[PDB]
Amino acid sequence: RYDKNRGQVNNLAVSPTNFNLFNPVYSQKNNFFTFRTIDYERFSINYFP
């Protein structure tokens, strides 16, 4: 939450326009480096003559 109307006694003019503005970017996961399981018996080639 990037608005400065936090923890103030006044709280008179607050509204959805002023009170709880939100920046979603901070709720980011470890998406860049992601992995997954590999099947041993599956045949995926690795030879390129």
Footprint on this chain of other proteins (rule: CB under 8 A): 43, 45, 47-49
Minimum CB distance to other proteins, residue 47 (Å): 5
Helices (H) and strands (E) in the chain, counts: 0, 0
Residue 7 CA to residue 26 CA, distance in Å, equals 21
Minimum CB distance to other proteins, residue 25 (Å): 46
- Whichever of 36 and 42 has its CB closer to other proteins, that residue is 42
Q: Can you read off the two tokens belonging to residue 39?
A: 């099947």
- Whichever of 35 and 47 has its CB closer to other proteins, that residue is 47
